[PDB]
Amino acid sequence: VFNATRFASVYAWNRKRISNCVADYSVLYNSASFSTFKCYGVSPTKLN
């Protein structure tokens, strides 16, 4: 999703389904990656 080489066009976009897995969001804060990261509906740090 994030590290894919080329995403889908914004005109026709591909919705990826993430289910049955473990989401580790601590890697984002340990290693700085996202330049712009914001959460409208929830808190950025509480996603984990």
Partner 1 sequence: DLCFTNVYADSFVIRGDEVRQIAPGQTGKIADYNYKLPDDFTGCVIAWN
Residue 27 interacts with partner 1 (CB under 8 A)? no
Q: State yes or no: residue 26 binds partner 1 (CB under 8 A).
A: no
**Residue 47 near residue 27 (C-beta atoms within 8 A):** no
Using the rule CB under 8 A, is 42 a contact of partner 1?
Answer: no
33 scored as a contact of partner 1 (CB under 8 A): no
Asked if 45 interacts with partner 1 (CB under 8 A), we say yes
The CA distance from 48 to 39, in Å, is 13
CB 28: neighbour CB atoms within 10 A?
16
Positions in the binding site for partner 1 (CB under 8 A): 29, 32, 44-45
